[PDB]
Amino acid sequence: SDVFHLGLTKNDLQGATLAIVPGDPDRVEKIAALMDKPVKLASHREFTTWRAELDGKPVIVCSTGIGGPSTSIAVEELAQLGIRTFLRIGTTGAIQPHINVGDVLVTTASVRLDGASLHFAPLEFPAVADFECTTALVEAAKSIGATTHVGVTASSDTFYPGQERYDTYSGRVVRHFKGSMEEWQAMGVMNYEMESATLLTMCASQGLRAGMVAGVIVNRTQTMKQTESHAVKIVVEAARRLL
Amino acid sequence: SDVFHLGLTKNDLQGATLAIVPGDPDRVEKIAALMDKPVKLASHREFTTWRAELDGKPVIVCSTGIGGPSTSIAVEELAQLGIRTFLRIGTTGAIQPHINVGDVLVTTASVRLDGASLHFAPLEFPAVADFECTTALVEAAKSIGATTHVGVTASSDTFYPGQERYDTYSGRVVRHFKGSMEEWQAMGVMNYEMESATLLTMCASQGLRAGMVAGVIVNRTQQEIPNAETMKQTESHAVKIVVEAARRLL
Amino acid sequence: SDVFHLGLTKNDLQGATLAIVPGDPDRVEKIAALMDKPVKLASHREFTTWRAELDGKPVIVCSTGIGGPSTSIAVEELAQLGIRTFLRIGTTGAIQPHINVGDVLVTTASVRLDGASLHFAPLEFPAVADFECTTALVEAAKSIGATTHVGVTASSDTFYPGQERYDTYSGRVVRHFKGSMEEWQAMGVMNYEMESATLLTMCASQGLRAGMVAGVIVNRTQQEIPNAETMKQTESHAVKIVVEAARRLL
Amino acid sequence: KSDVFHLGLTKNDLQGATLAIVPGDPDRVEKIAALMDKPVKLASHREFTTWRAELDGKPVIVCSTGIGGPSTSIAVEELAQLGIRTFLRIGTTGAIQPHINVGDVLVTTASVRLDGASLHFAPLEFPAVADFECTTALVEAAKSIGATTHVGVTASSDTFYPGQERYDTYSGRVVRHFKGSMEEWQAMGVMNYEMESATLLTMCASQGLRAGMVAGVIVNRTQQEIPNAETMKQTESHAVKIVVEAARRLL
Amino acid sequence: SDVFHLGLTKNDLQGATLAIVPGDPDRVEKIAALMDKPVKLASHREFTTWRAELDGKPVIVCSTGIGGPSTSIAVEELAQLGIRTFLRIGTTGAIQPHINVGDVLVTTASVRLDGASLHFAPLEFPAVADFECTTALVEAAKSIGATTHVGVTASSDTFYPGQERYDTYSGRVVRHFKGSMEEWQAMGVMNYEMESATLLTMCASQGLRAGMVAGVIVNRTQQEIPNAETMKQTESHAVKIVVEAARRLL
Amino acid sequence: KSDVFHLGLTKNDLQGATLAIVPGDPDRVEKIAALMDKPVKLASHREFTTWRAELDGKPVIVCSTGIGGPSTSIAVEELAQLGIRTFLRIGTTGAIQPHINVGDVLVTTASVRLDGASLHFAPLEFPAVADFECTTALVEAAKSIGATTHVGVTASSDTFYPGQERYDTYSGRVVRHFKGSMEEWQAMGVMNYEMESATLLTMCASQGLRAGMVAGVIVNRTQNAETMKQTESHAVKIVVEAARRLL
Numbered sequence A: 001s002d003v004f005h006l007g008l009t010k011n012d013l014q015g016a017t018l019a020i021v022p023g024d025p026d027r028v029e030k031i032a033a034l035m036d037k038p039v040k041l042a043s044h045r046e047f048t049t050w051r052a053e054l055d056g057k058p059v060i061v062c063s064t065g066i067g068g069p070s071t072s073i074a075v076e077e078l079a080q081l082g083i084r085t086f087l088r089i090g091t092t093g094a095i096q097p098h099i100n101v102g103d104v105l106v107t108t109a110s111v112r113l114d115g116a117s118l119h120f121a122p123l124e125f126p127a128v129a130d131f132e133c134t135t136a137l138v139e140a141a142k143s144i145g146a147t148t149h150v151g152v153t154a155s156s157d158t159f160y161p162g163q164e165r166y167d168t169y170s171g172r173v174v175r176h177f178k179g180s181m182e183e184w185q186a187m188g189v190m191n192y193e194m195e196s197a198t199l200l201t202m203c204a205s206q207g208l209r210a211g212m213v214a215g216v217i218v219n220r221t222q223t224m225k226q227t228e229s230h231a232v233k234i235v236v237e238a239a240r241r242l243l
Numbered sequence B, C, E: 001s002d003v004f005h006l007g008l009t010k011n012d013l014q015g016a017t018l019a020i021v022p023g024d025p026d027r028v029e030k031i032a033a034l035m036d037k038p039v040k041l042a043s044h045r046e047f048t049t050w051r052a053e054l055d056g057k058p059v060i061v062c063s064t065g066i067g068g069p070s071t072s073i074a075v076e077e078l079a080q081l082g083i084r085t086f087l088r089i090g091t092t093g094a095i096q097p098h099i100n101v102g103d104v105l106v107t108t109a110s111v112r113l114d115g116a117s118l119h120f121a122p123l124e125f126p127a128v129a130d131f132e133c134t135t136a137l138v139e140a141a142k143s144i145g146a147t148t149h150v151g152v153t154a155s156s157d158t159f160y161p162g163q164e165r166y167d168t169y170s171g172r173v174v175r176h177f178k179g180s181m182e183e184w185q186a187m188g189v190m191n192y193e194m195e196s197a198t199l200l201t202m203c204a205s206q207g208l209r210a211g212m213v214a215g216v217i218v219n220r221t222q223q224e225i226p227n228a229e230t231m232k233q234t235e236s237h238a239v240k241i242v243v244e245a246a247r248r249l250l
Numbered sequence D: 001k002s003d004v005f006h007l008g009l010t011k012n013d014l015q016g017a018t019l020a021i022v023p024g025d026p027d028r029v030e031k032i033a034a035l036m037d038k039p040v041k042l043a044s045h046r047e048f049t050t051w052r053a054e055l056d057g058k059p060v061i062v063c064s065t066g067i068g069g070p071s072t073s074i075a076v077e078e079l080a081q082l083g084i085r086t087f088l089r090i091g092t093t094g095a096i097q098p099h100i101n102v103g104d105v106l107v108t109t110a111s112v113r114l115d116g117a118s119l120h121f122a123p124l125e126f127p128a129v130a131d132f133e134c135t136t137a138l139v140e141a142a143k144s145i146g147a148t149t150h151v152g153v154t155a156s157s158d159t160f161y162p163g164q165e166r167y168d169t170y171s172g173r174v175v176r177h178f179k180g181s182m183e184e185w186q187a188m189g190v191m192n193y194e195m196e197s198a199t200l201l202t203m204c205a206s207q208g209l210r211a212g213m214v215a216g217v218i219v220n221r222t223q224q225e226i227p228n229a230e231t232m233k234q235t236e237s238h239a240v241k242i243v244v245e246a247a248r249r250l251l
Numbered sequence F: 001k002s003d004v005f006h007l008g009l010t011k012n013d014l015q016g017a018t019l020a021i022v023p024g025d026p027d028r029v030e031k032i033a034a035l036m037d038k039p040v041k042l043a044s045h046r047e048f049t050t051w052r053a054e055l056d057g058k059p060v061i062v063c064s065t066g067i068g069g070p071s072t073s074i075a076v077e078e079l080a081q082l083g084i085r086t087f088l089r090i091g092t093t094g095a096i097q098p099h100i101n102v103g104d105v106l107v108t109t110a111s112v113r114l115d116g117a118s119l120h121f122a123p124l125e126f127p128a129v130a131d132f133e134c135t136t137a138l139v140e141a142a143k144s145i146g147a148t149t150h151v152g153v154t155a156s157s158d159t160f161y162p163g164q165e166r167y168d169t170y171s172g173r174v175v176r177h178f179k180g181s182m183e184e185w186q187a188m189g190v191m192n193y194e195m196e197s198a199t200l201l202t203m204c205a206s207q208g209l210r211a212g213m214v215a216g217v218i219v220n221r222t223q224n225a226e227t228m229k230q231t232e233s234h235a236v237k238i239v240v241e242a243a244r245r246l247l
C-alpha cells in the first residue's frame, strides 16, 4: 500500500480523481453496483474501498466511517492517491417541520459542531461546499425528480448530546448543547449529521472540491431503504456531471 | 419613516423584495441608473436609498457604509420594510497571485473576522451565501464575459491590522492577526473585504437570501496603491453583473 | 490625498493634533460652527471633515460613521495625518433607571461587544479612556452645568440583537445576548452605543489619547421611541461639552 | 434483533455483562475474545463489531469503537444502555518522548482534549481523567506480565495527521493552532498520541461510568514515522494480554 | 536567600525532595509537629516554611495560601530549591449528598475554574494528579481507616460566585457560573476547593509529582455554616493521612 | 464572634468605616495604619491581617489581601459585607517600559485581565477599570507629595513567573499563550506587571463599589532592599493622602 490505512496504491485507482464517500462500509458495494464494472479493492478497519466505471471513467467509492476523525484519515489518504473531488452521501435526521422522511438534502455549508475541522482551519473559516459540486448535486436531484431542500446542516461530533437527544443513559445534555436544537431550527438549519463539517472544512481549506448530500430517514419534530436508494442514485448522477 | 435610520416607509418600496446593497453611498445612484425609472428616496447618515425598476418590478438600492455594524442596521431595517433578497456589490483586495486587478469575485462563504455576525449566530455557524443568489451572480458574470473566481472571502472588521497592513501609524499588527494573510492564502481564500461575513451570517440565519460579488481593485501580492482608472472600470463591471444577477432573482 | 479614505493631506490639518469624532456626518458642521474660522475640507463616503480654530489653535472635526470598522479607518488615517487626541461625541440609549433623557454620560471604559477592538488588542485588554480626556470631559460637563453620569458603557457591533432589541424582523436574539441587558444593568453599565470599544481600545494600545461623551436620547427601562425636539437639544448640550473639553486638552 | 440504534445488540445478548473492552480496530475484537473462555460473535455493523466472552465465569463484552470520538461516543453510550458500567480501551499509539521505546505499553491517567466529542459531555475545563480503579488494575496487570510500562498523560487528537503535527501530507502544512504543538506537549511530559481516549474518559467520568486506557507503542515520533509490522503485531498481542488481565481485576 | 518570596536557601532544605503544601499558614506548625525534629525556617507574607524529618529523611512543610497565584509562587520556588514531590492537604465543601462532614477526599483530577493553570498549560490539558501520589494517599487513608471518596474536584478562583454562593453583598452570580454547581453535581464532581487545579496542572506539565487530599468540613446539600468541634477534628484527621502518604513516597 | 467567614470581623469592629486600604503584603498593614491616628490591631487570620485607624476624625480600615485574585476576592467581598464601599490598593510592581524608573509611582486606570477571578464577576469583555474619583484622588495625592508618577494600563497576572514572561525558572519555559507577551504589552503602552488589580477592579466596578490602584516600582524589566523600603513608604504616603480626599 502507498498509504497508512486505506490499503491502496495509486495503480488501484486507475487515474481516478473523484471519490464518492459514504459513512457506512456496507453502503460501498450498493453505490458501486449502480455503476459499470464495480470491483472490491480493499477493506481495512472502517475503510472499505470499491472501484467502478462511470461513463468510461474510473470512480472510487470509499467509506469514511462515522465522524470527522476517520473521515479526515480517509479523505487525506485518498488525496495522496490522486483524488481531488469528494462527494459525500449520508443519512440524516431533519429538524425542520416542512422536511419529510424520504426527502433529499444538499448542504451548502455546515455548522461546525465537530473537533476535526479545527485541525484544518480556525472556527471562523466556513465549512462551505464546493460550488460546482453543490450545483451538480442539485441538478442531479432535479434530474431524478426528488423532493430536495438546499441549505445549512448541523454537523455534530456526537449522535446523542450534540443532537440534543435526552433518551440516553444519563438523560442529560451539557449546558452548551441545552436548547441548541431549537436555536438551529430558528436559524433555518435543516438537519443533523456527523461528517460534513470536517469534510467540507478540510477540502475547502486545501484546494479540494467537496459536495454533501443526505437522505432524510427521520424528522425530529415528528422507507429507510428506499430513501438511501434515492440518495445513492443522486450522488452517482452528480459524479457524472463532475467527471 | 417606518424605521429608525433609513427614513423609509413600506409604501416607499412599492412592493420591493430585492435590494442591492453597496458600501459606498455614492455608488447607489450609479447602480440605480443602470435600471429603469430610477428615483432617489432618502439619504440619512451613511444610508442612501434609491428605488428603480427591473423587468417591471420595483428594486431597492441602499448603501450600508463600511463594516458589519451599519450593514446590520441597513439589512434589518430593509427586512422590516419587506426586503427578502440582498445582493452586495463591493470593492476588494485580492490575496491570491492568480487573481488580477479587474477580475470579479463571487463569494460562496466568508471567514468571519467580524463582530456583528456573532450577534446573529455563534462562530461555528457558516457565513454562507444563498445558493440561488450565488448561481445568479456566477451566471450573470458569465453572461457579460468577465474573468470570474468563485470561493471563500476573508471579511474583516478593520481595513488595516485585520488585513495585515503594516504601513500604519503604529506599524504593528496584534498577535492574533500576525501571519494571518499567509494562512488565509494557503487556505485558498481569495480576498479581503469588510461586510460579507455580517451580511451572509445575518441573512442565512434569518431566512433571508444573500449574495456577494466584488471587483478586484488591488492585488496584495503585486501592488499596494489602486489605479485611478481601472477602479472606475472595475466598479462599472461589477455593477453590471449585480444588476443582471438581480434580473434572474426577481 | 495622503490617506486612503479621508481625502486629506497633512497641509489641510494645519498642524492640528486634536480631533473631535462624531458618528453622524451631518453633525460635523454643527460642531465646527461652535468654534472659530470653520472650513470644510473633504467629504468621502461616511467621512466628512471640517477644520476649525479653538483658542487660536487648529482643531479637526471628522465623522466616523456607525460602528468600529469605519471608526477604525477614520482614526488610523487621522493618526497618520498627525492627530494624537480623539474626542468622541455620540448619542446613546441608557439602561439604568436613574439616568434620564437629556443627561450626558462620560465613559471611563467600555464593555467590548465589538469585533474591531480585537484587531488592536486581545479581549483581556481594557477598552479604557485616557485619564486627561475623561477629566476634561467631566470638568467641561460641570462647567456648563449638565446632569452627568460617569462610568462603564456597553459598546455593541449591532443596534438591535446586541442591545437586546426584540422588535425586529426575526423577533429573536441569539443565545449569547439573551438576558444580556439585565446582566449589564446589574453590573452598573450605564448605556449602549456602537463605537467606544473600538475607539478606546485602538487608542489606548497605540499611545493615542481618547475620550468619550454621549447624550441620552432614550431610556430603555422607560420607553423605546425618542422625542424629536429633545434629541436636537441633547445633541446641542453634548456638543457644547465636547468642544469645552477640547479647550482644556489643547 | 436490536435494543440500540447502531450496535445491533439486545440486552439479552450481553447475558448480564457489566464490563466492556473497547478496541478501535474491528479486527482486534476477535483477537481479544480469543484470550477468554467460550468466544462467540454477536454482531457486525458499520465499524461496530461485538464479541461475547467469559472471564472467570463472568461474561465480558468486546466491542470496537472505530477511529475517533464520534463513533466511540455512540459505542460507549449504547453499551451503557445495555448495562455496561466499566469500559477498558486498548489501542495503538505513537510515542513522542525519547525514553519510550517501540513495544512499550502506556497507561493513561488523563488526556489532553484535542477532540470535539468530549465537549458534548463536559466543558473543556473538565479533566479527561481515567477511573482510579481501572488505572490501578491496568498498571498492576502490566506489572503482572512484566512489560515496560509508562504511566502519564496522553494527547488525544481528532486527526491522525495535522493534530499530531504530521507534515508528510497532501497539503504539507499544519494549521497555526497545531504548529509547534508536538514540541509543546513533549515539554509538558505528554507521552503519546492517540485518537479516542479524550472522548472515552470525559464521557465516562462525567456520567458515573468507569474507564481505563492502555496502548501499545508501535512508533516513536523522535525515532521514525513508519511502524515495523512485526513488532506492531507483537505489541498488539502484548497489550491485549494486559487489558484482559486488567478486566480480571475489575470484575 | 536563593528565592524571591520564600526566604529559603538550598541549604535550609538539607536535600529535601518532598513538600507538604497546606493553604493555611497556621497548619504548617501542626503538620511539622507530627514528624521528628521540627524547626521554623522562614515566615514571609503568606508563606511559612518548616523543616521536619520522616524516617531519617528531611521533609519540608510550606504554606501556599488561598488560590492559584500564591500556590504558583510557592511550588515554583520550592522546585528551584530542590523539591520534586508536592502533597496538598486542604479543607473543602462537598457537593454530593452521599459525602458527609468528616470524610476525606482524594483528587484524581480537577475541573479548572482557575486562571493560574492556564499560565502553565492550555485548558485542554488535564489537571491530573500523579498516579503514585494518589495511590499513596488512598492507601494512607485506608491505613488509618477513614471514610474516603476518590474522584474529580472543582477548583475555583473564588470562594463565593465560582462556588455558586448567593449569600453575598451583590447576591448574584455571573451568567457563566449560574447553575454551575448543579452541572458539576450531575457530572459526579465531589467538592469545591481553591488550589488543586493550579497545583496539579503546573506539576503534571513540568515533570513534578503532585497529590491532593482534603477534609470535608461543610456540605452544600446539607448545611452552609461549618460545625463546632468536628471541623477541628477533620483537620487533624486529614493531616495524619498526608504524612502517612509522604512515608510511602519517600 | 464573627459576621464573616475568613476575616474574623464583626460590623461593630469597623465603627462605620466605609473606606479600606488593601495591600497585598500582611506586614504592610501595620506600616499604613501607623501613618494615621489611633492604630489598633483587629484580626490576623490566614493571610488576612486587619488594622483600624482614624483619618481626619473618620475611621479607616487597613486589610491585607495576600497575593493574587482568589484571596483578594475573599477580602473585598467580606469587607463589603461589613460595610466597606471604597477600596484603595497599594502594591509593589515590576515596570516594563524603559522610561519608568525604580522608585516611580504608578496609578492604574484599568488592567489587562490575565487573571481567573475577574471572570467570576464579569465576562472578559467587561473592562477592569478603576473608579474615576479614586483614580483622581490618587493622581492628586501623588502630585501633592511630589512623586514621579505615570498613569495608564497595568497587566495583572495570576502568576509571578510565566504570566510575566520570566524564564529564570525550574522549567525555564513559558507556555505558548504567554510567549512574547511582554513585548506585546510593551508595544501597547502597558506600564507594569502586578497580581491583584484585575480582580479588584473588575469585582468592584461590576458591583457598585469604588476602587483605586497605586503601586511603587521596585524593578524595571528592561534593565534592591534599601530602595524597596523607600519606594514602599513613598506609595504608602500617597495611598493615605488619597484616602483623605475620598472620605
Ligand SMILES: O=c1[nH]c(=O)n(COCCO)cc1Cc1cccc(OCc2ccccc2)c1
Binding pocket: A066, A090, A091, A092, A093, A094, A159, A163, A192, A193, A194, A217, A218, A224, D004, D005, D006
Ligand atoms: O438523527 C440522525 N442524526 C445523524 O447524525 N445521522 C447520521 O448518521 C449518524 C450515524 O447513524 C442520522 C440520523 C437519523 C437516525 C434517527 C434514529 C436512529 C438512526 O440510526 C440507525 C437506525 C436505522 C434504522 C432503524 C433503527 C436505527 C438514525
Ligand SMILES: O=c1[nH]c(=O)n(COCCO)cc1Cc1cccc(OCc2ccccc2)c1
Binding pocket: B066, B090, B091, B092, B093, B094, B159, B163, B192, B193, B194, B217, B218, B224, B225, B226, B227, B228, B231, C004, C005
Ligand atoms: O484591500 C482592500 N480591502 C478592503 O477591505 N476593501 C473594501 O473596501 C473597504 C473600504 O475601502 C477594498 C480593498 C482594496 C483597496 C486597497 C488600497 C486602498 C483602498 O482604498 C480606497 C481607495 C479606492 C480607490 C482608489 C484609491 C483609494 C482599497
Ligand SMILES: O=c1[nH]c(=O)n(COCCO)cc1Cc1cccc(OCc2ccccc2)c1
Binding pocket: B004, B005, C066, C090, C091, C092, C093, C094, C159, C163, C192, C193, C194, C217, C218, C224, C225, C226, C227, C228, C231
Ligand atoms: O439605543 C441606542 N443605541 C445606540 O447604539 N445608539 C447610538 O447610535 C447608533 C446609531 O443610531 C443610540 C441609541 C438611542 C436610540 C433609541 C431608539 C432609536 C434610535 O435611532 C435613530 C433615531 C433618533 C431620533 C428619533 C428617531 C430615530 C436611537
Ligand SMILES: O=c1[nH]c(=O)n(COCCO)cc1Cc1cccc(OCc2ccccc2)c1
Binding pocket: A004, A005, D067, D091, D092, D093, D094, D095, D160, D164, D193, D194, D195, D218, D219, D225, D226, D227, D228, D229, D232
Ligand atoms: O501515531 C499514531 N497516532 C495515533 O493516533 N494512533 C492510533 O491509531 C490510529 C489509527 O492508526 C497510532 C499511531 C502510530 C502509527 C504511526 C504511523 C502509521 C500508523 O498507521 C497504520 C499502520 C500500522 C502498522 C504498520 C503500518 C501502518 C500508526
Ligand SMILES: O=c1[nH]c(=O)n(COCCO)cc1Cc1cccc(OCc2ccccc2)c1
Binding pocket: E066, E090, E091, E092, E093, E094, E159, E163, E192, E193, E194, E217, E218, E224, E225, E226, E231, F004, F005, F006
Ligand atoms: O466550601 C468550601 N470551598 C473552598 O474552596 N474551601 C477551601 O478553603 C478556602 C478558604 O476558606 C473550603 C470550603 C468549606 C467552607 C464553608 C464555609 C466557610 C468556610 O470558611 C472558614 C471558616 C472556618 C471555620 C468556621 C467558619 C468559617 C469554609
Ligand SMILES: O=c1[nH]c(=O)n(COCCO)cc1Cc1cccc(OCc2ccccc2)c1
Binding pocket: E004, E005, F067, F091, F092, F093, F094, F095, F160, F164, F193, F194, F195, F218, F219, F224, F225, F228
Ligand atoms: O515584577 C514584579 N511583578 C509583580 O507581580 N509584583 C507584585 O508583587 C507580587 C508578589 O511579590 C512585583 C514585581 C517586582 C519584583 C521583581 C523581582 C523580585 C520580586 O520579589 C520579592 C522581593 C522582595 C525583596 C527583595 C527581593 C525580592 C519583585
Ligand SMILES: [K+]
Binding pocket: B046, B064, B065, B066, B067, B070, C046, C064, C065, C066, C067, C070
Ligand atoms: K459605517
Ligand SMILES: [K+]
Binding pocket: A046, A064, A065, A066, A067, A070, D047, D065, D066, D067, D068, D071
Ligand atoms: K469512526
Ligand SMILES: [K+]
Binding pocket: E046, E064, E065, E066, E067, E070, F047, F065, F066, F067, F068, F071
Ligand atoms: K494568597
